[PDB]
């Protein structure tokens, strides 16, 4: 029920708020106040989804979709089945995400390690807020947010892109896509490298830190280093959303023509026109 070595680390403390109250475990799960609020929201949120969906026409998981309100309704509270559920779902979402996060902080203080993980986790929360809270506020309606449906959310992505004619030309999208790609690659190299060194094959000797470093110098002429590739991978993944946010946020509030036309700033410099 406990790992071979878990026992020793299981001491009280590190709570953010709450203290000894919820400072305990259930199974492998640590609880804590935020563990108590995480559950609360989830519970509400999943029940909201169940009820809302129970009032729609389909149960096919793929086709079910819970949608935000019509623009008409502005930033105000909307009829239940016409956006209301969506609103309340959104709040639970954030409720859960944020508890999740804080929970991770207490888990970290207890263990005596850095806060980098919850910290890192803020990046995806922030993006959820950009799409669902900030952009619509900027545009003036909750009806510009995305719908909760396995496939139907892709339909929002799609049309959203197409509203700007060719989304691919959105400069924050280019930067976004570009981190998405580097990071996916770095992950493969980082993991292949590690495993290549500890699993040479046959019965050859496990290699060393030195070998990791000759490998890449040899290859690309440069090696970042063991700790630094963790710092970099943390940076590339994050920038996927940090940079993207800009692209998203400009679309509508800061820009209304087609993205390609944005590049006129280059193309149209008078010198070379």
């Amino acid at each position: 029920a406990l790992l071979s070595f878990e026992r020793k680390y299981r001491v009280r403390g590190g709570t953010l708020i709450g203290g000894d109250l919820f400072d305990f475990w259930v199974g492998p799960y640590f609880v804590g106040f935020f563990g108590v609020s995480a559950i609360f929201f989830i519970f509400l949120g999943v029940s909201l989804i169940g009820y809302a969906a129970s009032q729609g026409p389909t149960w096919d998981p793929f086709a079910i979709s819970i949608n935000p309100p019509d623009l008409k309704y502005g930033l105000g509270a909307a009829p239940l089945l016409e956006g209301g559920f969506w609103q309340a779902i959104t709040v639970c979402a954030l409720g859960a995400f944020i508890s999740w996060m804080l929970r991770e902080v207490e888990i970290s203080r207890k263990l005596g390690i850095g806060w980098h993980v919850p910290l890192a986790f803020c990046v995806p929360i922030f993006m959820f807020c950009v799409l669902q809270v900030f952009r619509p506020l900027l545009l003036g309606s909750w009806g510009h947010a995305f719908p909760y449906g396995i496939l139907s959310h892709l339909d929002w992505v799609n049309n959203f892109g197409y509203q700007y004619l060719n989304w691919h030309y959105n400069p924050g999208h280019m930067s976004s896509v570009s981190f998405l790609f580097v990071n996916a690659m770095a992950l493969g190299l980082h993991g292949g490298l590690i495993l290549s060194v500890a699993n040479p094959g046959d019965g050859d000797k496990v290699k060393t830190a030195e070998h990791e470093n000759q490998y890449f110098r040899d290859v690309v002429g440069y090696s970042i280093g063991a700790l630094s590739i963790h710092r970099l991978g943390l940076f590339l993944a994050s920038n996927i959303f940090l940079t993207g946010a800009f692209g998203t946020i400009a679309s509508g509030p800061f820009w209304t023509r087609g993205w390609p036309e944005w590049w006129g700033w280059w193309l149209d410099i008078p010198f070379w026109s």
């Binding site: 993980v117 690659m185 993991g191 094959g201 993944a237």
Partner: protein, 323 residues
């Protein structure tokens, strides 16, 4: 905080290190040089690089590929140097605009494209060899090479293989900054919305998962930096607090956990998978699926919505409506 996790406070400098391989120790060119600024966020040694056959070959094919592209682009602006720098992003070397089926197409309509494509494949292949071979030489496993092959493969997929299946070079990917991009749209358009391709959906998950995992793995490592969490290798052969802590952190959050070695495996697998899932979906498009959305509807998963503005019948499908 642990400032070490942000940048290196006190940089060390020492003799350069050289691990010997079964071969090519004599093919390492360059005088290693140090950079102080870079030294803060990474190792400071730039160099040297190893040459060798495969590498040099790779430079060779590659470069050929390139002149080919640049030249055709250069022509695209009737060799005006200035409009060249200017329109760059817009210039490209296209696949055959006409249908020639599988026939080696005229140089003007696609011929130069298939050549470029060739030298790029040769170039990719040689580089592959380098990746595989330098691993073998230093007594390392082939893992990186095996992920790389998956990426080569996807590229091949969307360049030769898919065009080969359906029988039209007209479907390959053009070369150029905006052009390779518009291909995406034209490709999706034609095949009925790629959002409906389950393999696009698989790829995306893995890609996002990639994001999620490097972020978490990275952060996890800095968070234990203090216990030497970074010396991953020795943390595998001899578990330490760092990994113990990193394990229980994840155990207590999500209920389960990996090991220091296994996480690299989940990372590697995820990575590979992005590319593998993509290849499947491309190989299946056109060969067996004409319209992804409709294939989805065929099988009952597409969502449907009410009309907002009134339903609009296809004018063409009306009585005595022109063609």
């Amino acid at each position: 905080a642990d400032y070490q996790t942000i940048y290196t406070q006190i940089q060390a400098r020492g003799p350069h290190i050289t691990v010997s391989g079964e071969w090519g120790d004599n093919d390492r060119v360059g005088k290693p040089f140090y950079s102080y600024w870079l030294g803060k966020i990474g190792d400071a040694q730039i160099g040297p690089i190893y040459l060798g056959a495969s590498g040099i070959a790779a430079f060779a094919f590659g470069s050929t590929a390139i002149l080919i592209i640049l030249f055709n682009m250069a022509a695209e602006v009737h060799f005006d140097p200035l409009q060249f720098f200017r329109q760059f992003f817009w210039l490209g070397l296209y696949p055959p605009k006409a249908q020639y089926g599988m026939g080696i197409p005229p140089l003007h309509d696609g011929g130069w494209w298939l050549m470029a494509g060739l030298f790029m494949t040769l170039s990719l292949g040689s580089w592959w060899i380098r990746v595989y071979s330098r691993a073998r030489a230093l007594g390392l496993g082939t893992h990186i090479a095996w992920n790389f092959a998956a990426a080569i493969f996807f590229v091949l997929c969307i360049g030769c293989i898919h065009p080969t299946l359906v029988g039209s070079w007209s479907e390959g990917v053009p070369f150029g900054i905006w052009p390779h991009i518009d291909w995406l749209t034209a490709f999706s358009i034609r095949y009925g919305n790629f959002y409906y391709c389950p393999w696009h959906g698989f790829s995306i998950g893995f890609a996002y998962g990639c994001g999620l995992l490097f972020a978490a793995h990275g952060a996890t490592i800095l968070a234990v930096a203090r216990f030497g969490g970074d010396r991953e290798i020795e943390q595998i052969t001899d578990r330490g607090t760092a990994v113990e802590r990193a394990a229980l952190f994840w155990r207590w959050t999500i209920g389960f956990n990996a090991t220091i070695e296994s996480v690299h495996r989940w990372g590697w697998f995820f990575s590979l998978m992005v590319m593998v899932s993509a290849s499947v979906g491309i190989l299946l498009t056109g060969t067996f699926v004409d319209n992804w959305y409709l294939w989805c509807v065929k099988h009952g998963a597409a969502p449907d919505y009410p009309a907002y503005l009134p339903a609009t019948p296809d004018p063409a499908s009306l009585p005595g409506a022109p063609k």
